[PDB]
Design a binder for this molecule. Sequence first.
Ligand SMILES: [Mg+2]
Ligand SMILES: [Mg+2]
Ligand SMILES: [Mg+2]
Ligand SMILES: [Mg+2]
Lengths: 129, 206, 217, 125, 87, 96
Amino acid sequence: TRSSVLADALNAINNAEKTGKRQVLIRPSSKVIIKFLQVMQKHGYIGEFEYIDDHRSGKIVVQLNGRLNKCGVISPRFNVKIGDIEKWTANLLPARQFGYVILTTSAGIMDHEEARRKHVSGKILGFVY
Amino acid sequence: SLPATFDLTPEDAQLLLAANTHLGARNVQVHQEPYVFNARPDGVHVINVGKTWEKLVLAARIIAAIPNPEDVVAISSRTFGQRAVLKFAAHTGATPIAGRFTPGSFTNYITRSFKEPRLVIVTDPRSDAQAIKEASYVNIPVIALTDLDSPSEFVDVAIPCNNRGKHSIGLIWYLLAREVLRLRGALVDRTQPWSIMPDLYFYRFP
Amino acid sequence: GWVPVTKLGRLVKAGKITTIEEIFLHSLPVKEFQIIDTLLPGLQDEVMNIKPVQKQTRAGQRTRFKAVVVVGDSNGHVGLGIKTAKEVAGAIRAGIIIAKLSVIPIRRGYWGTNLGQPHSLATKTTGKCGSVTVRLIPAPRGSGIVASPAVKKLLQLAGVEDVYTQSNGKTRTLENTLKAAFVAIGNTYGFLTPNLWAEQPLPVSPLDIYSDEASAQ
Amino acid sequence: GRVRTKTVKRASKALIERYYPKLTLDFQTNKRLCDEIATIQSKRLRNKIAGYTTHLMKRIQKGPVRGISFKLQEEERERKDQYVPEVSALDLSRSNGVLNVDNQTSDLVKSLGLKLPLSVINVSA
Amino acid sequence: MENDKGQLVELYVPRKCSATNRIIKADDHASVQINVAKVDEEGRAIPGEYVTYALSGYVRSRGESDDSLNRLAQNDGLLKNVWSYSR
Amino acid sequence: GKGKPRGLNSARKLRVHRRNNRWAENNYKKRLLGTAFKSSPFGGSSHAKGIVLEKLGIESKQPNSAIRKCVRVQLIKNGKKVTAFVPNDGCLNFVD
RNA sequence: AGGGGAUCGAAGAUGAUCAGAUACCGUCGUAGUCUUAACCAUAAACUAUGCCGACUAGGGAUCGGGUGGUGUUUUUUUAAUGACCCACUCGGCACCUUACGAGAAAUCAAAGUCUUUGGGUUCUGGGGGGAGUAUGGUCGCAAGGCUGAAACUUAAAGGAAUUG
Ligand SMILES: [Mg+2]
Ligand SMILES: [Mg+2]
Ligand SMILES: [Mg+2]
Ligand SMILES: [Mg+2]
């Protein structure tokens, strides 16, 4: 069944970006999908998105530019020591310059560079570029 | 970015409806649904001819904008389009390919039919498929006359009309050329209707 | 001498196009190798492989030659071509003609920091052809070109300095290998990196500023 | 097979293509005409060509051939313009100043905001 | 793309498609550029002023080139009441 | 889902599966069955002295006929008979 | 193990011919084929495509349900139904196109969203033979099934496509 929401969300977004569409309709939504998207947005990988109430669990409509090569979810949210980040970013992202392996820490969800700065770490959600 | 002039004239619309350009075929590609106005109880669709018009004006602005009026290519293997296109070429000085479009007329610099357009206009995007396909190999924009069941692959600015009946065809071509010449300056004012009859464009066989 | 037959050729011979960068920017399809010749003077070829091929034409058995040839600036331009002819030097000739034709740019960039000239690649890329995949990864400077002979030549002749590769599949078929590698460098200019986000104003084609010129007589 | 070599057929084709007037069904005048209009290096090959222009001249007096006739082409160019009807089908006068049209097409015209003389001929299946 | 001295160091900033914001690349012979003519009050189009669009070979092959052109033009003042934002 | 468990508390299933699957490797099977100490004529050593039992004129036909000047040797440590090549020697004046 | 035992028919019984177009072929025919109670657990048991979930192109069909129609045929005096027709809609079922995509290719709406490699989970494979053999264990009245090696041997065995 629908085991991870984040997974299907990011899947939808990706597929849509490949087709070259301009908007997607994610369902359902989560505190996590919300935060993940806010981080996606902060670096401008997507335009603006709207949460649609319906009392169940909302839908989301995401508008996207075209700046999204691939976003994905790394699946079993492995834990990561701080020194370990380097290895993940050495695999997933296409380049040392840009891209973002975004984590879940006890100090909220955020990209890995903010994890570098705040000096914390946690589990690893997914990755954007 | 266009004056209150360019809007559809009562006369024009009369012409269109007289030639049944508004009569669309029985099936609609999901790609041309916005063109469809309403569907008749017999299963025949109706085209927003306002949109037919605006797309005509567009295709015209494009045909206009090309620096050398020779490069634009009208095409048709379709019977009716032959006649119409020929005239189009005459009054507009574009180059014409009536009848059999020789393959590799856009690739292959060695053959004698080799031409290097900067815009292709096509009557039927199905019967003239290969010209579209071939234009796609060499960055050449296609502007077609599509019915509501015409493959909109490798075409930009489709003109929704009626590829079936000869009146529709001739009329559309003629309107096209006329609009072009109105844009160049060749037919000075816009109140002046074309001295030339659309019937010159119609397909006649003895 | 040479007589152009294409409204891109007459543009070139009349010195109306300086660099290839103006061909590439607008994707104007080359069909006259002399174009590449004048625009790329410092193009140094290299026959990668020569192979006796047994033809059987209507009970008449013949021996021809298949030649895999690479060309390139040691700046940012490559080309690859395969050709079969009846005579070896003829094959090589024709091969170089073909590779001249299919010349491609390359986005070469930095590893991490940002000093001097761009040395390696910009991002990880991957080409696939046949069963073979070839993957190219940014190296740090002075890491040389880590690849088998063939792919190494192709990258050297394309002004890559530092690049890790990873292949997969039957890499022993050198034509698929070369083709695939070729694809992978030919994808670099195709990966939208954030420093290319800034909207440009659309350039107006050489074909329209110089349209009166290079028009057929 | 007495199949005439390509030089004879091609020369016959061209000679009749530009000099249809002075050639008849007779070989004896087509021959001396082939002497006065053309420069053939041999008498035998000239008899070949002039004789085949004789046969072909006997084939063109009955019907139009796959070649080029300018006497025809001028009128084929006139014919293209000749029949431009004084009142086409696209002139409203052909239906009493009214346009016979469907309920839905009339809806369309009403929606565009265009005043046209329309007769609403309703349709069904 | 710059280096440390602040100077650009590419072969070329490439053309992006207008519908899709993806990059058009050099071997893409299905990509296209569309010049539409700027017009005078007298309905004459000026010889050298265009509103131009770019289209990826992808969008033209997929058969969305048209609808894309519509939206684009309509939003850039060329058309009106052709293209709906809703369907 | 690429047919293997991918869960975070799934290690046991993974590694067990790996152990059950390494028995299709060839060398691994040799190495945990002690095939070298139980069967291999050398007993798992780089060399063995033996005493020439019989001078063999084997004849090995296709595609190239070796007038196989080989030997039956019996290894001293196993009392185990073996055949062996005696290289570079045309006449076998060296090995009796 | 009973009942049944028409047809057809492994076994078997009998004939043949007459030639190397060859024993088909023939005629009986026992078990079997049908069933009742037990067993057996295997097939090219095949879509040679595990199951759940999400997403990503059109087009013809059709099967099942549903919503709409001052649509049609059915007369009685108009309905009511019922079949049909059009539009839509879930759920099937096959087909026809393509490819953005995959693939070694044939081909594939999944065999796609896979080096830009991670939605959950089960099972299986690691050159060809030796061999589904030996041995043990287990299930079966038996025929057998399940589980299942090694020594030794070998440079290929194999896939798909292409020319003659
Ligand atoms: Mg390998
Ligand atoms: Mg089985
Ligand atoms: Mg099976
Ligand atoms: Mg094995």
